[PDB]
Design a protein around this nucleic acid. Structure first.
Lengths: 85, 308, 79, 51
DNA sequence: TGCATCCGTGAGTCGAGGGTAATAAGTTCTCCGAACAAAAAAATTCCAGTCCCGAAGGACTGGAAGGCTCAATCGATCAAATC
């Protein structure tokens, strides 16, 4: 009856892709890809985890200010609860 | 035990006396079960009031005739079977029926009180042929469930009733005809289970959906001792129907809503153009547009950049 | 329709032209990229065309007018 | 691999898609009649009792 | 005119499993030809080497342009009053 009396209860009642994008997609310059691989950053979310100040100490900003303003990015943006794997 | 309880999906109702009430899905072995296990209720055990006893003056039996009447007494006995009624609070009501005129005798002709409810007043009970004769009968109403015909009713009524008193096969239950079926139903790998399709037509004095509520209670009450983007959001601060949220944001190199949502209102308001009253004109913007304090923008800047 | 073709050959009068008026008609949604005129009802186009006939808006002649006027909107459009 | 969407892409296609059923010897014109399928899960073919 | 001859026919599929076996020579003698060998290009792969607007980037020079303390003295705020 426990089986039957519960099937009457239908009757007695009812009538961002950009964030995970890696480093090589940008066709980026050979001098700055010699530097972003020298500054040890894996994803673009790890890059914007840093700021623009955290890139200037490496030898050999207008390029990233050109390309980030096109496809919907910026710099200086803080991430939390990262990484999501 | 992880049983597949259903959800009722649909009623396909034709008019105010008819419905097709489908269902999906059940397990195999309960679809055939329930579609029969309700049909034993709607035949014999649904309580309602019906016409039982019939008293006309000047009669002897129904094989006889009556002049001034088109039909036979049996066909007039037939109509009271197809007549629908509802006694509310009482348990035995008797009614009267007296007419004159050239024509039919519809169901307005019953002298009622406020506790007996006819749903169909156009129901003809007799036809007067010429003006001369007339019908004057009395009919009786009783309460019960199911159906008892006057064959076995007189086997159960041993009253030696006097001549002039007639008795019809009472229609206690409201179900006129119901049927049911079983098609197949699918869960996206198992195409073995069974849907339930039930066709149902009852008389008046009821909703055609009220019965499946009402009758399936009674089977269950038997078991209780057994279970025991926005357009102006692509638009700078000078054109949003506001004016003290426009002129004082572009002087921190944010000419738009864009870096307004990332930057913090403890410093953007601390700059010498905003302050402690601008949060009424930023947070109310962020109420309707949903953006946050520090949010990452999906696609903010187009090629166009301008000012005023 | 879905089950028979009687109610459309009451209009067309032949068991083969109802194929042939819809052999012509039911290509315009496969590779022609167009849409029908009736409610679609998730239907494959060999009956979507059969719907358009048996709703009385298509015989063989009325197909031939929408295929003429398409060509005179490309003929002077070039010039 | 008999994967998940494979059925429900096929299930859209065979809806309103005709098919033939032929018995040899197809001894008159009604020995080959069109049909429309309704897909069962099994290994044999179920036919209508008035054909 | 038979009489006598011969050509050309015979429901449709699933299948269910694969193909044999008879005896048959030798001598020298010699051009036609192979693939392995074994060089001899030619084609690429590599390796440093000079040029040139830019190349991460620092600095510079240059006009412009900037924030908020006071104090004589104005005018008006405050607060009793008062028509």
């Amino acid at each position: 009856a426990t089986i039957l009396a519960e099937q009457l209860e239908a009757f007695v009642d009812l009538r961002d892709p950009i964030l995970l994008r890696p480093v090589d997609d940008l066709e980026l310059t050979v001098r700055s890809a010699n530097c972003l691989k020298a500054e040890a950053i894996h994803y673009i979310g790890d890059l914007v985890q840093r700021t623009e100040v955290e890139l200037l100490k490496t030898p050999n900003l207008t390029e990233i200010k050109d390309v980030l303003a096109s496809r919907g990015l910026s710099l200086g943006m803080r991430l939390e609860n990262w990484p999501p794997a | 035990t992880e049983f597949l309880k259903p959800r009722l999906v649909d009623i396909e109702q034709v008019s105010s006396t008819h419905a097709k009430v489908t269902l999906e899905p059940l397990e195999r072995g309960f679809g055939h079960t329930l579609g029969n296990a309700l049909r034993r209720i709607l035949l014999s055990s649904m309580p309602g009031c019906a016409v039982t006893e019939v008293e006309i003056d000047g009669v002897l039996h129904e094989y006889s005739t009556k002049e001034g009447v088109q039909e036979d007494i049996l066909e007039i006995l037939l109509n009271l079977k197809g007549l629908a009624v509802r006694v509310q609070g009482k348990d035995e009501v008797i009614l009267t029926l007296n007419k004159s005129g050239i024509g039919p005798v519809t169901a307005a002709d019953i002298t009622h009180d406020g506790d007996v409810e006819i749903v169909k007043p156009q129901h003809v009970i007799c036809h007067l042929t010429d003006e001369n004769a007339s019908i004057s009968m009395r009919i009786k109403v009783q309460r019960g469930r199911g159906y008892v015909p006057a064959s076995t009713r007189i086997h159960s009524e041993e009253d030696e009733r006097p001549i002039g008193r007639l008795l019809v096969d009472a229609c206690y239950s409201p179900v006129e005809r119901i049927a049911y079926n079983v098609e197949a139903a699918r869960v996206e790998q198992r195409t073995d289970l069974d849907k339930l399709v039930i066709e149902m037509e009852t008389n008046g004095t009821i909703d055609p959906e009220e019965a499946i509520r009402r009758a399936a209670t009674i089977l269950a009450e038997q078991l209780e001792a057994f279970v025991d983007f926005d357009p102006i959001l692509l638009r700078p601060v000078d054109d949003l129907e506001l004016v003290r949220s426009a002129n004082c944001l572009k002087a921190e190199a944010i000419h738009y809503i864009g870096d307004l949502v990332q930057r913090t209102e403890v410093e953007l308001l601390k700059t010498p153009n905003l302050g402690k009253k601008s949060l009424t004109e930023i947070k109310d913007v962020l109420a309707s547009r949903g953006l946050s304090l520090g949010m990452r923008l999906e696609n903010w800047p187009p090629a166009s950049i301008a000012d005023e | 329709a879905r089950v028979t073709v009687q109610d459309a050959v009451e209009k067309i009068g032949n068991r083969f032209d109802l194929v042939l008026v819809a052999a012509r008609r039911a290509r315009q949604m496969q590779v022609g990229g167009k849409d029908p005129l009736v409610p679609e009802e998730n239907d494959k186009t060999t009956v979507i065309a059969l719907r358009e006939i048996e709703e009385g808006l298509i015989n063989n002649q009325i197909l031939d007018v929408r295929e003429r006027q398409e060509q005179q909107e490309q003929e002077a459009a070039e010039l | 691999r008999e994967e998940a969407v494979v059925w429900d892409i096929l299930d859209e296609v065979i809806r309103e898609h005709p098919v033939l059923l032929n018995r040899a010897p197809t001894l008159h014109r009604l020995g080959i009649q069109a049909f429309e399928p309704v897909l069962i899960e099994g290994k044999a073919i179920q036919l209508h009792p008035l054909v």
